[PDB]
């Protein structure tokens, strides 16, 4: 709820004029009541799907080949930042394996882990 709320506040802003993109969330955990309500509030431009970005079938479901970009959000408040960074890097690896030409913007928690993206 928190991360998607912040992302939608920053992205789907009223002051922003040219918004022809449709937001598609892909997550393997079913949203709770508040998150479903938040998705419902932005139903005209936000869609959610239950799947894993590491599963090629779920990547096929969300039409990665036709997706303009893939944005990966990190867990800012976690016990082990390195584990979350490695998980996000592995998600990047899976997405690039499915479609090497897609543009990816990923959130990282530590500076050194960015090296693994090279």
């Amino acid at each position: 709820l928190e991360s998607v709320s912040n992302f939608l506040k920053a992205f789907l802003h009223k002051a922003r004029d040219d918004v022809n993109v449709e937001i598609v969330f892909l997550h393997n955990i079913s949203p709770n009541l508040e998150l479903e309500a938040l998705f419902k509030r932005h139903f005209t431009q936000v869609e959610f799907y239950q799947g894993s970005v590491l599963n090629p079938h779920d990547l096929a479901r969300v039409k990665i080949e036709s997706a303009d970009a893939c944005l990966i959000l990190a867990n800012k408040y976690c016990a082990d930042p390195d584990a979350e960074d490695a998980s996000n890097i592995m998600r990047v690896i899976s997405i690039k394996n499915y479609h090497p030409k897609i543009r990816i913007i990923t959130q990282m928690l530590q500076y050194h882990n960015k090296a693994h993206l090279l």
């Binding site: 393997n28 894993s52 590491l54 599963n55 584990a83 490695a86 998980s87 890097i89 592995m90 690896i93 899976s94 693994h116």
Partner: protein
């Protein structure tokens, strides 16, 4: 020479082809060097402090044609059985000059747990560090090694199953 009816193990495309094997006719000074059984190379027990290699010491030491085992474990990780990896590599039918040096790259806290089953082997070295460290891998001369084995020593992790190989892949 084979005797009476002996089972033979065959590699074949189908069982009908291996059935042909049964239907065949010609016309129609005194130092302990091995273990008790002699099956595996053996050595006197060594303290773990003797085999620890620092970055500088490993760098000065030249290592060619060795085996670099990179393990991801900590003190609380589940113990994989590393003796099952070293024993086939010291099998008494390789000559002592044919044995490959085994360098373990990983947390020393994890390896101290398992050293009780590994101290009786001829040539094993430990470099306390991280498999993800380029400096540590360069100290062991990973480009001169015969094989690098990346073991998911932290198998006890239970997460999103796909995110279980993250450390090995990285």
């Amino acid at each position: 020479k084979i005797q009476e009816g002996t089972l033979g193990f065959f590699i074949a495309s189908d069982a009908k082809e291996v059935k042909r094997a049964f239907f065949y006719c010609k016309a129609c000074s005194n130092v302990k060097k091995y273990d008790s059984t002699g099956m595996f190379h053996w050595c006197a027990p060594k303290e773990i402090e003797k085999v620890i290699l620092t970055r500088s010491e490993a760098a000065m030491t030249v290592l060619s044609g060795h085996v670099v085992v990179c393990i991801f474990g900590d003190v609380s990780s589940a113990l994989i059985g590393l003796r099952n990896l070293v024993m086939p590599l010291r099998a008494s039918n390789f000559h002592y000059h044919e044995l490959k040096h085994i360098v373990f790259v990983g947390s020393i806290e994890y390896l101290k747990r398992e050293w009780e089953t590994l101290h009786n082997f001829p040539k094993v070295s430990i470099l306390p560090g991280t498999p993800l460290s380029r400096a540590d891998l360069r100290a062991v001369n990973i480009n001169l090694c015969d094989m690098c084995v990346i073991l998911s020593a932290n198998q006890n992790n239970i997460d999103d199953t796909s995110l279980q190989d993250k450390e090995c892949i990285l």
